[PDB]
């Protein structure tokens, strides 16, 4: 009995002497005395040798070297069984044994000594649908074979027995929720070094082999496929064939699609005389094979039977005549035959070839009837190469213009039409897909609409793909590049980085270059700065505010000399030592330099640094905007800054000192120095302690007729005092100041009445006033309504984060109805509004044709209030262009009404990020 079975197994299939097999032997021993696995799953890529491993396991058992403690080891081959047949477990077990029914009955008496090896369980994913099935618990009940396997996996049947399963990485998606506490083992094919050695031996010596070699082994999708020895052999054979054909081969030599096309088309031409077409029968056969492969890919199926071949009028003889390579292998000793492609990557190639030939004729009249689509996607993108389509044109004697090319172009363009920026991941995926085509015209037609790009460079091959695809982005105006740890520490990498930099320093429309969170070494910065020196480089804007480039700053000061198109430089968060400051000042003094803006936020400036900046400010330079935010400015540094700003040689127009630690003494020094200044027009003093003395000194400075200030930002400064009397009196007698911002100051109704009275004067020419989080209440809304009716110049009024309330808003809406107003922007975000005031707001919005912008976030509107507001937005006379809302906070009815609002008025933008839009450089200081 048992020995006879062992002999039969040894005869059929003919261990534990290698470090690899001992893991399988020991995998059935306790982990920590609390667990002993009863299920092992081996998974890997196709062709790595898993069925061989299972057969080796069974053979080692029969010989008596593996799992010797088991009483029986069964073997199942999933390919060679008909899943739709009805049977019972006893019959399946008996099929393997020499009809020893007595032994089979004896086998079931000791379930705890049993072991099942199931091979190729992936193929059944198409039948293991997303639905429950009857759970069997006896080995004598006749159920469909897939029910048998489903019951055996969940350990409802023979619950005490051990299991081993082999499957593909893509078949696990439904096993993992079916098995109980499995142990996973990863089977890996050829090593990286071995694959590299094998590929490196088949490149042509005369040609530039290194570039093609590194472009082949650095593509992770291609290289990982080469773990299977069969795929590595196909790649090597294709390389040798391309070498043999010399100049007769016009197909690409890098993409896997090029190699597969070489291999497949070279065979198809063997029977034909040089450059002659195929017959109609052969065309039908090829199209049928392609259709069968495509249907198999779509329906999660990779094993085909005689029934499937008939549907597509296929025959093994016909296929072997077409290709001499015997593409469809025949598997299964049974009287019923099973067919599988030579490799699973060849099913993808023939599946993608269907989209290219499906349109040439009406083939259907002849025929009787995720992660798995990645390979087909790559092949489909790589088959649009024109040198490849020429061969198809020759074979089929007809022009080949597939209708899928337009679809791929439309998808890639849709990627770049997104409004809230582009996704770096989708961009990189599309760039990987477009690199496979290798067609300049198709690629260039795909990348037309890319006006901005955000990249995320993780591997070397992202540099090459980006360089290739960026060269055809002619309408590209801004780019952001994030490179974390790839160039952080000190060669192919440097060469590809240099090529990437050269491609950037040649686009003619590129204005802004942001470096994101990149961490660049000294040499990477050297290469970048050397490549940006080019005379074809038009980059104006340069940002290092989030990157770490301290170690190679000296290469930027030299870049400042030469590139004369550069006008904006951001160095936020970069430490600035004395020597670096001196070099930067000398670079900015050079007559060739044309840098107008210079931001030094959080640069840790010393007193000597401030002395150097002070000396720079008076020298002949083109600098007009300077930022020193988040730098501690002391008394002596402030004295130097004042001595620079009091001179008549200083032409600076903007100055940001936000959060510089200014005190009343330093503020007094600053504003005293500013009295003699005639050029400054923008000033920001946010997040500093000013005081009443400081406000008085500032108003004294404003009174001077020689003054030129136009914008004044004082966020988070003042104190509850009469300091608002000074400003109120100064506004009523001012013709130059246009923007005033008092955000996060404790103003209150008392000072609001004074400001409103000052604003009502026809002599006041103020245009924008910001009162965000200023402590206003419902008391001052009457004054605001009167001022809104009366003024003629005010155009912007922000009242966010103030508890105006429903009554306050109802009062304010009496001044928003009148046609004597000129307000165009109004902020009412977070004002504690409800549905009570929606009537007044709706009336104002309907009756007002001048209002252009409106903020309504952070309030609590019900469904009826929002419906009234939407009806108001739909009115013909309303001209709103920007509306501040989050459309995801409201029920379906309100959301469909908002969509109708957007439809009736195609120019309205309904976006919750209201401070993103600035028509008049409102954020000149925050940048």
């Amino acid at each position: 009995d048992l020995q006879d079975y062992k002999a039969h197994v040894i005869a059929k299939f003919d261990h534990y002497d290698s470090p690899e097999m001992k893991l399988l032997s020991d995998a059935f021993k306790p982990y920590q005395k609390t667990f002993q696995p009863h299920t092992i799953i081996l998974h890997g890529r196709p062709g790595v040798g898993k069925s061989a491993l299972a057969r080796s396991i069974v053979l080692g058992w029969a010989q008596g070297k593996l799992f010797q403690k088991m009483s029986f080891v069964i073997f199942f081959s999933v390919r060679e069984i008909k899943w739709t047949e009805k049977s019972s477990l006893a019959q399946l077990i008996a099929k393997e044994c020499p009809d020893s029914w007595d032994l089979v009955t004896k086998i079931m008496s000791q379930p705890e000594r049993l072991l099942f090896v199931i091979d190729g369980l992936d193929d059944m994913d198409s039948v293991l649908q997303h639905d429950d099935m009857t759970l069997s618990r006896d080995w004598k009940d006749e159920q469909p074979i897939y029910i048998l396997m489903y019951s055996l996996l969940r350990k409802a049947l023979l619950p005490q027995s051990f299991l081993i399963i082999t499957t593909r990485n893509t078949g696990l998606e439904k096993l993992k929720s079916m098995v109980v506490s499995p142990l996973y083992i990863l089977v890996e094919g050829l090593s990286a070094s071995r694959r590299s050695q094998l590929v490196l031996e088949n490149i042509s010596n005369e040609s530039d082999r290194i570039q093609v070699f590194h472009s082949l082994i650095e593509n992770h999708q291609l290289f990982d496929q080469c773990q299977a020895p069969s795929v590595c052999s196909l790649v090597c054979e294709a390389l040798q064939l391309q070498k043999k054909l010399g100049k007769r081969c016009t197909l690409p030599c890098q993409t896997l699609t090029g190699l597969y096309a070489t291999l497949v088309f070279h065979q198809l031409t063997l029977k034909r005389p040089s450059q002659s077409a195929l017959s109609q029968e052969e065309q039908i056969t090829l199209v049928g094979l392609c259709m069968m492969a495509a249907e198999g890919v779509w329906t999660m199926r990779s094993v085909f039977y005689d029934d499937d071949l008939k549907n597509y009028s296929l025959k093994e003889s016909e296929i072997l005549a077409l290709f001499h390579m015997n593409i469809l292998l025949q598997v299964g000793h049974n009287s019923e035959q099973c067919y599988v492609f030579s490799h699973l990557s060849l099913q993808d190639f023939f599946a993608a070839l269907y989209y290219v030939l499906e349109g040439l004729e009406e083939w259907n009249q002849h025929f009787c009837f995720d992660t798995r689509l990645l390979g087909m996607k790559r092949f489909l993108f790589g088959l649009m190469n024109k040198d490849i389509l020429k061969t198809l044109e020759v074979l089929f004697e007809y022009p080949v213009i597939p209708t899928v090319e337009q679809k791929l172009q439309h998808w890639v363009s849709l990627i770049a039409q997104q409004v809230n920026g582009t996704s770096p991941m989708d961009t990189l995926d599309a760039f990987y897909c477009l690199f496979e085509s290798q067609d300049e015209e198709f690629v260039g037609g795909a990348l037309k609409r890319f006006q901005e790009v955000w990249l995320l460079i993780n591997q070397k091959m992202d540099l090459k793909v980006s360089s290739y695809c960026l060269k055809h982005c002619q309408n590209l105006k801004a780019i952001r590049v994030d490179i974390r740890d790839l160039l952080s520490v000190d060669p192919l990498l440097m060469e590809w980085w240099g090529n990437f930099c050269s491609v950037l320093g040649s686009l003619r429309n590129l204005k802004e270059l942001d470096l994101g969170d990149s961490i660049l070494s000294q040499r990477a910065m050297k290469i970048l700065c050397l490549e940006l020196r080019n005379q074809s480089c038009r980059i104006q804007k340069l940002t290092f505010k989030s990157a770490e480039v301290v170690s190679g700053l000296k290469h930027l000061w030299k870049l400042l000399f030469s590139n004369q198109n550069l006008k904006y430089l951001n160095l936020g968060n970069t430490p600035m030592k004395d020597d670096d400051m001196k070099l930067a000042c000398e670079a900015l003094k050079h007559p060739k330099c044309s840098v107008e803006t210079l931001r030094l936020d959080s640069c840790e400036l010393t007193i000597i640094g401030y002395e150097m900046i002070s000396t720079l400010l008076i020298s002949t330079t083109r600098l007009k905007c300077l930022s020193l935010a988040k730098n501690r400015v002391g008394v002596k540094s402030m004295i130097s800054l004042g001595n620079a700003l009091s001179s008549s040689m200083c032409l600076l127009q903007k100055l940001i000192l936000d959060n510089c630690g200014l005190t009343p003494a330093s503020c007094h020094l600053l504003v005293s120095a500013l009295f003699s200044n005639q050029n400054l027009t923008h000033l920001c003093l946010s997040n500093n302690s000013l005081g009443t003395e400081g406000v008085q000194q500032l108003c004294q400075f404003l009174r001077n007729p020689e003054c030129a200030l136009q914008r004044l930002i004082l966020n988070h400064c003042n104190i509850v005092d009469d300091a608002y009397g000074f400003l109120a009196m100064r506004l009523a007698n001012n013709t130059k100041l246009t923007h005033l911002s008092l955000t996060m100051n404790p103003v209150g109704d008392g000072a609001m009445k004074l400001l409103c009275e000052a604003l009502k004067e026809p002599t006041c020419y103020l245009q924008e006033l910001e009162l965000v989080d200023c402590q206003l209440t419902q008391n001052c809304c009457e004054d605001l309504a009167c001022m809104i009716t009366t003024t003629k110049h005010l155009k912007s009024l922000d009242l966010g984060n103030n508890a105006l309330g429903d009554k306050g808003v109802i009062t304010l809406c009496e001044g928003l109805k009148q046609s004597s107003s000129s307000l165009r922007r109004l902020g009412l975000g977070a004002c504690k509004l409800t549905s009570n005031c929606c009537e007044a707001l709706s009336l104002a919005i309907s009756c007002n044709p001048h209002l252009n912008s409106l903020n309504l976030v952070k309030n609590d509107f019900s469904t009826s209030g929002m419906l009234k507001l939407c009806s108001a937005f739909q009115c013909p006379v309303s001209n709103l262009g920007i509306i501040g809302l989050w459309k995801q906070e409201y029920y379906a009815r309100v959301r469909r009404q908002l969509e109708e609002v957007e439809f009736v008025k195609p120019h309205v933008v309904i976006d919750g990020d209201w401070y993103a839009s600035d028509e008049d450089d409102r954020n000149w200081w925050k940048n």
Binding site: E20, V48, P182, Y184, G189, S191, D224
Partner: protein
């Protein structure tokens, strides 16, 4: 032609598809990584990245393979490189 490894249930199947390979001296790899096979498991859980070592070039180079996210791979690689540099001092 075959290598076997154990994949913990918590490591996704989506992250064995693009490893990171780096080479260093064999003896340095022995001194740093070691052979306990439980220390290595704990550090794999910490970094969330699998680690393997295979002798190459007659025992003069090792092929370190790291799986996971790009950030997890960077973390594991930097830890290994810091320890190795300590050794090479």
């Amino acid at each position: 032609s075959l290598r076997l490894r154990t994949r913990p249930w918590w490591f996704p199947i989506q992250e064995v598809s693009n490893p990171l390979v780096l080479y260093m001296e064999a003896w340095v790899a022995e001194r740093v990584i070691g052979t306990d096979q439980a220390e290595i498991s704990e550090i794999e859980w910490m970094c969330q990245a699998l680690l393997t070592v295979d002798s190459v070039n007659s025992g003069n180079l090792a092929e370190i393979t790291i799986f996971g996210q790009p950030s997890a791979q960077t973390r594991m690689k930097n830890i290994l490189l810091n320890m190795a540099a300590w050794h090479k001092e």
